[PDB]
Amino acid sequence: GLVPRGSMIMKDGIYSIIFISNEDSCGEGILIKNGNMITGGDIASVYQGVLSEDEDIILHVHRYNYEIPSVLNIEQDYQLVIPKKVLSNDNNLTLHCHVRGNEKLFVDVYAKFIEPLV
Amino acid sequence: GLVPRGSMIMKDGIYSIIFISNEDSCGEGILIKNGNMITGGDIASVYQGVLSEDEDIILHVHRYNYEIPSVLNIEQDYQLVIPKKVLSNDNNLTLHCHVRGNEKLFVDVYAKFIEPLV
């Protein structure tokens, strides 16, 4: 089962990710965790941020292919606030992230551990 | 214009990548370059490798979703050899990568620099 735990407890490695927005649009991507560093992306945007702790974990989202819609229909670069605690297992986790400054704009994410860093 | 250069001279950061295989199947993905470390993936596989410089660069491809076809139709994990030489810019590059052990199996890749990492 999943249990509330701090994100920083996540094992280092590459994860597969699936997410759905308040607009009810879905997307899938990849996520890489190294130290407290988080980098990732899907066919249209890439994301980067640093596991906070003592700070609001901010994830900078950057769109790179506008011929593909944003799961959030924003149309520019934004920030997602990552929860300090997530529901997790040794290899699975879910979290609810919302756009900074707008709780009504959000995505629910499920992440699955794929493998350790080389 | 693109000029021949050492692949290991690529700017660290997040890259979008598009590729076509000898079988005429195309795929798209993301690629992250940190030090000599390269990590990335698409909707069905993830990859990790180390920009060598004294050894042929081996990119380890791990298939994580077998419900989606691989651009090479290998049906298992494999290794790609990454050229020490690439045709590149300060933001673009292309390369021809063959499967370790079989030059007849390969992907021709175009990579676009998206943004540097934190």
Author numbering:
A (entry chain A), B (entry chain B): -6 to 111
What does the paper say about this structure?
GrlA and GrlR are two LEE-encoded regulators that are required to optimize PLEE1 activity. (2) GrlR, a negative regulator of ler expression, might act as anti-GrlA to establish an additional checkpoint that down-regulates the feedback loop, setting it back to the steady-state level. In agreement with this hypothesis, GrlR interacts with itself and also with GrlA to form a macromolecular assembly in the cytoplasm of AE pathogens. Here, we report the crystal structure of GrlR from EHEC refined up to 1.9 Å resolution as well as structure-based functional studies on GrlR.
The model was refined to a final R-factor of 0.215 (Rfree = 0.269) at 1.9 Å resolution with good stereochemical parameters. The GrlR model consists of residues from Met1 to Val111, with seven additional residues at the N-terminus (Gly-6, Leu-5, Val-4, Pro-3, Arg-2, Gly-1, and Ser0) resulting from the linker sequence of the (His)6 affinity tag. The C-terminal residues from Asn112 to Lys121 had no interpretable electron density and were not modeled. There are two molecules in the asymmetric unit and they are related by a 2-fold noncrystallographic symmetry approximately parallel to the a-axis. The GrlR molecule mainly consists of a single domain from residues Asp5 to Ile107 that forms a β-barrel. Residues Tyr59 to Asp70 form an extended loop that plugs one side of the cylindrical β-barrel structure. The β-barrel cavity is highly hydrophobic in nature with side chains from seven Tyr, six Ile, seven Leu, four Val, and two Phe residues lining the inner cavity surface. During structure refinement, we noticed a small molecule composed of 12 atoms in the hydrophobic cavity of GrlR, which, subsequently, was identified to be the fragment of Triton-X100. The strong hydrophobic cluster at the dimeric interface is maintained by the side chains from residues Ile7, Ile23, Ile25, Val39, and Ile107 from both monomers of the dimer. A loop region in the crystal structure of GrlR, residues Glu46 to Asp49 (46EDED49), is highly exposed on the surface and is less well defined in electron density.
